[PDB]
Design a protein around this ligand. Structure first.
Ligand SMILES: Cc1ncc(C[n+]2csc(CCOP(=O)(O)OP(=O)(O)O)c2C)c(N)n1
Ligand SMILES: Cc1ncc(C[n+]2csc(CCOP(=O)(O)OP(=O)(O)O)c2C)c(N)n1
Ligand code: SF4
Ligand code: SF4
Ligand code: SF4
Ligand SMILES: [Mg+2]
Ligand SMILES: [Mg+2]
Lengths: 1163, 501, 167
């Protein structure tokens, strides 16, 4: 049959049919494969063996690889899905699986490796890092090829006994939606070598015919034993070739180890791999038709590299070859495929000029114009070697010049772009539109979706294509027949109409009439609309959704508007297909919700209005841009162009060579995405600063000021007298940042006043006023205040050093980290694991961590997902070494002729260098005396003082903080976390426990509780939550605390200060509510209160220092719960979707046994 | 001064002097490096910074690699010692350490990877699995070269900001005892770029001048950002070349990125790496004196591969080249060094027949008779390609035939074999005899010891050499002047008097 | 345990008079718990394939004594003693039952005989030292224990790294 799938589903489709076991661990962009395979098993899909696939999630990809090895050696056909850092961790077992000649297929959505920076996007770096493991390597260039070559790998590996890596380009193919021919499981079973399967069973580990494998070998036999597998590798090309003939006879699609496309007498040929082959062939057709003698060799079987099969498809007329590698091996003579092609041609005496280049790193665009640039370089008198395409390398001058722009899209292909808002339904509707068009017409259909780094309110751009010819355009749309803008705010912000064809369609969602178009649309947009004679349509979709009762959901409305004007299918047929999809999506929602979406379709047809614009729009002229403010070079040259969706134009000279970024750059974003913002009521405010404590974006803060400093304040900057003996004679005001607020509403819910002192008002109504208010509050001078930092009120007068991050509205993680920076941020270093905290904490080019007025703030680093504890441990060793070097120079100063005040501060620092307060006090004294002391010295004594000044940034004792999610702490990094805690180092571990993998969409973890439903736990998690805190208490010398800000502010304050002051390892497990729980994020703090009150989350503190004082180290901070445990589960969707009753009873019994055990440790 | 050390101790000597932190996890045959460095710190040995090296053991080499990254990013010069499966677990962090351009040296006793079987013995499989991490890779062929090139890597990585893998053959060099010239710590400190160390300190993570590193990047800037490090890799060959000249002026021993030995008009040349270079040069001297036009190119700096420095030492008369790789990449068209040599010669239009082979996997013996067989295949009408040496491949017929047996040991070299019993003291005594002979005569002294997996009651065979000339015989003894049998049970059981002169 | 347990070319693990004995495999230092976990999944898969073929034999024209042993094995396939009792009965009746069969029934009986080495319940043993269990392989050991799989982990605690000299 024909279905519209993406690469991941196409790969899982074949892997599911051919496998008994799948041991997995999630990683973008390969995890959709394991997710859909788990869903199919949950609904009872049968493989070719008549059984459902067994999906097992491990603690890491290393654990997955070992499970693959054991399952294979014991007689089960086993597969797995991975990519990038995950593939690296499987490399050790890949050597074993190949060495033991076990049939296997790893499905890899090829993704870049983490180098100077992490990248979730696609290139071949991960697959190339494993090319020496002995796995065969088979590359798929399109979604159709993912379907076909996945079957080839599974069939070939049984015959050859050589395991396969079947890889396809991450996102660019794994997430590209295409209508393809889907191979039936029954047809797969007719091609399987069942004798080869039975022989595999006979080799299995079995006590009734046992054997030994995995021995240790001496030099006498190891070399011979390693070469004994040569026949299997010599035979694999012929076996793969023959399997390709089986698939050809079944499907009609003919694959070869190397395929050729282009002129039979071509003189310039590109050798490439992966989805680039699609782009190159489309370009080759265009150039060959124009008379150019060019061609393309597609590499399917990269390993083993068969010289015979490569040379057979190489035309004898070839004089020049350009090899394209989607990877970079720094310092290498050339990249892997280039060195293979160069080698094979030398071994056979071919006099062919060969040149290698790099492309598409991290999903860098690779379009036909770049393909021609490669062909033009082959046509030059001296072709450039070791080149790059797709960038402007103005430092080392490796990039090829993109001379001209060509359009190689096949004629008759319709092209549409959809600019949407994050989670507004645009992407989902476009996927449904592709399914509609693919299922009911003869046209090929293609979809690709560009996402944003911002989790809420980000920009999404959908790229859709339909045509009578196969769609090989594995690149973004250049010339669109239709462009849709589903968010009117984008008008004037992004280049929406870029590249639209003359006479094309522009569909807009806005409340503006045709006359208001003159004043609302920018001049450049009006010029494009008029000159290209576009059909301009507008629709007030929000008005329709409001009147019907759908709120502000416009997904059904905007999809209806698209088919009405696109002329892709008969309008009457489209309306039926849309309503049929509505029944499939909203049939379970009820009868009322159904007919509302039916009314959305009907009203959308009549509300679509064509805008008759005057021809004089073509001559409109840009308005004079206001005098722009002088912004820093990084903001002006890097941050603004990236946010303007122009980062691809930045040349190499723009960036640091090591991926180092400035701090405090999110304050320049000012996204202004909130619908409502808190308005402060001065008369109801008790000045408690709890609103500043719970804000996940530091958008609301208290401000103190002497009455003289309120001089130039706007009339609306209403203040109140400051409560407290510390702030006597001062003014107080709770001020919100309107453009940085998210409208989550946590501050209004936490406000404990009798009458609410914070009320949610629409942003647009008060935005002009509050911007002037915030601009004055932000420029207020610093006020020296003696408020106790150990209190909630006192800590919020300290400046937050984590602000305006990309976390969701109401995120339960960032308030914890924000509070830590307010207590110790002046002197802390952060080692952050991969996950949500690394995405909102460190997504280029904006850094939410910032500095205070002295320029001091947290230094931030993220290494890997698995190494974060050891990462911060290494930092602690280095900081201790740097303080030792400083202490050595200061001790020498005591023997030097320096002032008595300098020696007094030096002795005070030496005695208290390991105390936070004393090291700052005497450290700041030395800093104040240094400039004068150096002036009064000369010779070697002056050098001794200059060495102290060189190291003065280590006088204050540092605070190492190891921050990461529960998936890091409980699973992949648990082994490293256990070791660092056992080491005794003075580090502070903060685990933001969301009980799921929050970043990757919500997959299961060991921190997931009983009965909770997440990915890889479709039927609910049976095993209970692993008690990380209890295992850390077994050491006795580890400070362990369980906290929840929503439940107790004072208990959180008490544990954080105790953990940091403790001279040893400290572990803080913080309950972090998340959007994946299925709750109202407005009441994120309230959900943590119900968690502790229902016995779901404990509050305790384990202080090893109490044991030395003769006291009980374990303190139970909440002994008797007052809320029902079963009622708390009912407040989150992650538990209600199970309804199942057996899991709810098991979850309550585990919470009582855990609470009773904590009572035993305290008694 | 002159001391009798093994490769591991020679490397640890330099690594200890040049490093503040060493985060380690033990694995044979690299763990002796971490053990002796731990002992020196316990005895209060000072590095060039006047302090003792801090040795911290992790839960695995993965934990060790992450600790190196954190220690480097926070401003401490950090080294580590690993091999084989241990180097594999460090590969993910190696991508980060190279990507962030952090100075660093990994000292690797190159060991086979676990494939069809585990092997604790030496080849380059582990090092070759990391050749795409962005680390520089420097190969030392002898105990003396381990001493010298370990210093080169530590000096170069500070100047280039590119981290180094300094690797030497496991057991064949790591456990080979040799009398060498030991470089004083005071002389190392006289060559260090102290400006480069201070600049490394300024980039450190510190809350008083903060920064962000390790970000996540979209397709818009990732490619450009990855190419922004090209100048550092383009400059690394010249930096290594200049550092090698500093060591040359200090020691008198002249190293280059690629070194040549043999006839100036050679027509057949072997390109190789590691301790095989010693065996080949000894054989080349023997053949050149016999009139054969043969030569050898020793690869020191494997990454970055500098075409200019390779072609600089390649004689214009060379017509045929055999490349030897001490690894196996099953299904590959050729092994790594063979594909590098094939590529560079094609990029410069050289009409040279190039042939690649495999040798010495899992410490398989590689002696002069095997070297001549490689040279003999270059002299054939149709040289066999994709070959093996040291085994008999009667299935796929890749092995070269060992036609004749030659003795290329320099005359005047005394050679002794000692057949001992497990833990009967023979190996310990022979080590003391090498130290005695090395410390009190002008003779070079060499010791290599063949062990069993059994801890008690195994057979041990000690191979000792003394001579007036440097001992390049990185292979077992062929013709012994003296054979000692310390266990009467072996009489009638083993061929004790085999090959005695 | 892997050096004295599996150093080529001699294997210390041996078989009984019927030729049955432990099958031995060593993967890596760090993955041993997950290694044996995968073995446990595979053996369970192989017993399910056998159990499906035995249930079809109940529906086939075979001797009553053959059906009695099949019902006894299906009821006790997860008990070591009971699966051996009825498993050995099936093994004794298989050659004669195949002789009296033809067509698809003969193929169904030959499929039981092809998988008769999974009638007896297997006992997965994950063996390693303290260095594996406490350090490099602890994260994998923790996960496999949390999974609930029916595996038997034996930690030979020497309180040191015995193999590498005592680290
Ligand atoms: C070795 C490796 N495997 C998988 C991934 C993909 N990955 C990154 S973070 C993450 C899950 C994060 O979970 P958690 O630690 O709980 O943080 P959270 O998002 O919930 O805050 C995954 C699966 C990776 N980056 N590296
Ligand atoms: C990834 C990896 N790291 C290190 C080693 C080296 N190695 C093998 S066994 C071992 C220690 C064995 O200790 P233990 O687990 O206690 O077993 P024992 O020999 O004491 O019985 C070490 C360090 C290795 N083979 N692989
Ligand atoms: S509504 Fe949310 S984001 Fe806005 S100030 Fe209040 S807590 Fe902060
Ligand atoms: S929570 Fe309410 S009462 Fe407390 S400081 Fe904020 S606005 Fe004032
Ligand atoms: S932890 Fe949850 S709420 Fe916070 S940013 Fe991640 S997905 Fe959003
Ligand atoms: Mg989580
Ligand atoms: Mg032990």
């Amino acid at each position: 049959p024909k279905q519209t799938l993406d690469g991941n589903t196409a790969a899982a489709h074949v892997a599911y049919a051919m496998s008994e076991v799948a041991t997995i661990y999630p990683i973008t962009p390969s995890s959709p494969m394991a997710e859909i395979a788990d869903e199919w098993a949950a609904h009872g899909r049968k493989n070719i063996f008549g059984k459902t696939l067994q999906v097992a999630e491990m603690q890491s990809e290393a654990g997955a690889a070992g499970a693959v090895h054991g399952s294979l050696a014991a007689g089960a056909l086993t597969t797995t899905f991975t990519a990038s850092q995950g593939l690296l961790l499987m490399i050790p077992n890949m050597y074993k699986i190949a060495g033991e000649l076990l049939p296997c297929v790893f499905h890899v959505a090829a993704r870049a490796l983490s180098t100077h920076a992490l990248s979730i996007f696609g290139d071949h770096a991960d697959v190339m890092a494993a090319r020496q493991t002995g796995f065969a390597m088979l590359s798929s260039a399109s979604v159709q090829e993912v379907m076909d070559l996945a079957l080839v790998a599974h069939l070939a590996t049984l015959k050859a006994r050589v395991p396969f890596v079947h890889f396809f380009d991450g996102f660019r193919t794994s997430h590209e939606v295409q209508k393809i021919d889907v191979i039936e499981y029954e047809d797969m079973a007719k091609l399987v070598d069942w004798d080869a399967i039975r022989a595999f069973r006979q080799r299995a580990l079995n006590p009734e015919h046992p054997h030994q494998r995995g021995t240790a070998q001496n030099p006498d036999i190891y070399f011979q034993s390693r070469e004994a597998a040569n026949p299997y590798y010599l035979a694999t090309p012929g076996i793969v070739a023959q399997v390709m003939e089986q698939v050809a006879g079944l499907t009609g699609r003919h694959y070869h180890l190397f395929d050729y496309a282009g002129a039979p007498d071509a003189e310039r040929v590109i050798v490439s791999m992966g989805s680039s082959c699609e782009v190159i062939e489309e370009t080759v057709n265009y150039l060959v038709e124009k008379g150019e003698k060019v061609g393309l060799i597609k590499v399917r079987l990269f390993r083993p590299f068969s010289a015979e099969h490569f040379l057979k498809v190489l035309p004898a007329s070839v004089k020049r070859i350009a090899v394209l590698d989607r990877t970079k091996e720094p310092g290498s003579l050339g990249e892997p495929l280039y060195e293979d092609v160069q080698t094979v041609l030398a071994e056979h005496g071919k006099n062919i000029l060969v040149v290698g280049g790099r492309y598409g790193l991290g999903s860098k665009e690779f379009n036909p114009s770049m393909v021609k640039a490669v062909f033009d370089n082959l046509a030059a008198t001296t072709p450039k070697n070791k080149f790059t395409v797709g960038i402007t390398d103005d430092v080392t001058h490796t990039s090829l010049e993109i001379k001209e722009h060509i359009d190689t899209s096949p004629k008759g292909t319709f092209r549409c772009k959809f600019f949407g808002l994050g989670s507004d339904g645009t992407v989902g509707a476009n996927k449904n539109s592709i399914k509609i068009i693919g299922d009911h017409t003869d046209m090929y259909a293609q979809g690709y979706f560009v996402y944003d780094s911002k989790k809420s309110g980000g920009v999404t751009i959908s790229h859709l294509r339909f045509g009578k010819q196969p769609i090989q355009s594995a690149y973004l749309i250049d010339q669109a027949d239709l462009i849709a803008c589903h968010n009117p705010s984008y008008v004037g912000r992004y280049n929406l109409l870029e590249g639209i064809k003359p006479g094309g369609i522009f569909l807009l969602n806005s409340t503006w009439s045709a006359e208001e178009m003159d004043s609302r649309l920018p001049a450049d947009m009006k010029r494009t609309i008029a000159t290209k004679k576009l059909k301009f349509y507008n629709i007030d979709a929000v008005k329709i959704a409001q009147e019907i009762g759908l709120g502000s959901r416009i997904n059904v409305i905007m999809q209806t508007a698209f088919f009405k004007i696109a002329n892709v299918i008969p309008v009457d047929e489209a309306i039926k297909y849309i309503k049929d999809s509505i029944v499939k999506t909203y049939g379970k929602k009820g009868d009322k919700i159904l007919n509302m979406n039916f009314a959305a379709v009907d009203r959308a047809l009549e509300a679509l209005e064509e805008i008759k614009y005057p021809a004089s729009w073509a001559d409109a002229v840009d308005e004079a841009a206001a005098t722009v403010t002088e912004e820093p070079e990084f903001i002006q040259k890097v941050l603004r162009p990236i946010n303007a969706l122009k980062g691809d134009e930045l040349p190499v000279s723009t960036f640091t060579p090591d991926g180092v970024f400035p701090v405090g750059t999110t304050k320049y974003e000012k996204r202004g995405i909130a619908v409502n913002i808190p308005q402060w009521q001065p008369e109801n405010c008790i000045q408690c600063n709890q609103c500043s404590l719970v804000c996940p974006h530091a958008a609301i803060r208290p401000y103190l000021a002497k009455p003289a400093d309120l001089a130039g304040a706007p009339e609306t900057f209403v203040t109140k007298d400051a409560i407290g003996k510390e702030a006597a004679g001062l003014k107080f005001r709770i001020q919100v940042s309107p453009l940085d607020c998210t409208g989550c509403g946590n501050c209004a819910d936490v406000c404990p006043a009798k009458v609410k002192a914070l009320t949610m008002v629409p942003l647009e109504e008060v935005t002009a006023v509050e911007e002037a208010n915030y601009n004055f509050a932000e420029q207020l001078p610093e006020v020296k205040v003696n408020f106790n930092p150990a209190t909630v009120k006192g800590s919020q007068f300290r400046q937050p050093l984590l602000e305006f991050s990309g976390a969701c509205a109401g995120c339960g993680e960032t308030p914890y980290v924000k509070l830590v920076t307010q207590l110790f941020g002046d002197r802390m270093i952060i080692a952050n694991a991969t996950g949500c905290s690394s995405i909102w904490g460190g997504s280029a080019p904006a850094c939410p961590y910032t500095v205070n007025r002295q320029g001091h703030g947290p230094a931030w680093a993220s290494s890997l997902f698995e190494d974060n504890a050891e990462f911060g441990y290494g930092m602690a060793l280095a900081v201790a070494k740097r303080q030792d070097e400083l202490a050595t120079a200061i001790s020498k100063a005591l023997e030097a002729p320096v002032s008595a005040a300098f020696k007094a501060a030096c002795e005070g620092w030496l005695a208290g260098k390991d105390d936070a307060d004393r090291s700052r006090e005497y450290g700041d004294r030395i800093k104040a005396l240094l400039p004068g002391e150096i002036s009064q010295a000369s010779g070697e004594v002056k050098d001794l003082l200059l060495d102290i000044d060189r190291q003065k940034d280590y006088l204050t004792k540092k605070s190492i903080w190891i921050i990461g999610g529960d998936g890091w702490a409980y699973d992949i990094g648990y082994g490293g976390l256990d070791h660092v805690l056992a080491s005794g180092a003075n580090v502070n571990v903060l685990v933001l426990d969301t009980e799921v993998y929050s970043n990757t969409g919500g997959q299961s973890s060991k921190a997931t509780q009983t009965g909770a439903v997440a990915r890889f736990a479709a039927g609910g998690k049976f095993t209970k939550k692993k008690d990380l805190g209890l295992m850390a208490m077994s050491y006795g010398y580890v400070y362990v605390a369980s906290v929840a800000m929503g439940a107790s502010h004072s208990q959180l304050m008490k544990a954080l200060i105790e953990a940091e002051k403790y001279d040893g390892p400290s572990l803080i497990i913080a309950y972090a509510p998340c959007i994946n729980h299925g709750i109202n994020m407005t009441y994120s703090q309230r959900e943590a209160k119900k968690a502790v009150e229902a016995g779901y989350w404990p509050l305790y503190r384990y202080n090893p220092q109490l044991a030395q004082e003769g006291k009980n180290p374990f303190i139970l901070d909440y002994k008797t719960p007052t809320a029902s445990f079963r009622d708390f589960l009912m407040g989150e969707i992650r538990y209600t979707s199970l309804k199942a009753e057996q899991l709810f009873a098991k979850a309550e019994a585990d919470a009582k046994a855990r609470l009773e055990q904590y009572k035993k440790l305290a008694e």
